[PDB]
Ligand binder design. Sequence first.
Ligand SMILES: CN(C)CC(=O)Nc1ccc2[nH]c(=O)c3ccccc3c2c1
Length: 204
Amino acid sequence: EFLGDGGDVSFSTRGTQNWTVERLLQAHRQLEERGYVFVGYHGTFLEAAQSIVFGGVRARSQDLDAIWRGFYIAGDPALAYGYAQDQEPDARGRIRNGALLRVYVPRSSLPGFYRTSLTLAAPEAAGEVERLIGHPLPLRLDAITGPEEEGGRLETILGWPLAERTVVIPSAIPTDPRNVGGDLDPSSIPDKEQAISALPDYAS
Ligand SMILES: CN(C)CC(=O)Nc1ccc2[nH]c(=O)c3ccccc3c2c1
């Protein structure tokens, strides 16, 4: 259990229960001590956050193409935040805010991390990434970081094999239940979390 101590952690529209930036700090120190390193944020809906944190990352399907299939994260919490919410409404039109998660990978997995300046959405990106990674997509126990299709923000994709090796914990950066869909309010980012958010150096 890499969640540190305090009470039971629970995701909810009111905010991640029993999660404070201080507990995150304890959790972060424990992970680092165990040889894990932070690689980015992952925004998703509440239940997927719960599953990811306590069950671990688990690929489910889509092999025909989905060439870029994998676990998408981002060094910049603002990019991942856009995804921390339900993808479709319920029968009554409600779209709940989700949660931001912190993704860690064993340091021994770092050799598989690559970065390119080429926008991943570019048509020839696949060919360039395959050259960079040394094999045909999909990504395996490796990852690639590159500019989002449009926006300039760097997105990181973890091959499912790598993703399933991660330890993921809640972020102390909250989503706003009053502003679903809205952009991340940078002032809602705890200084203490920003402090433990440096990324590892990737190969290019
Ligand atoms: C949940 N819907 C957005 C459908 C989907 O297929 N994608 C998905 C679902 C969750 C995602 N979470 C992220 O943190 C993220 C970060 C950088 C780039 C993409 C993502 C991301 C993408």
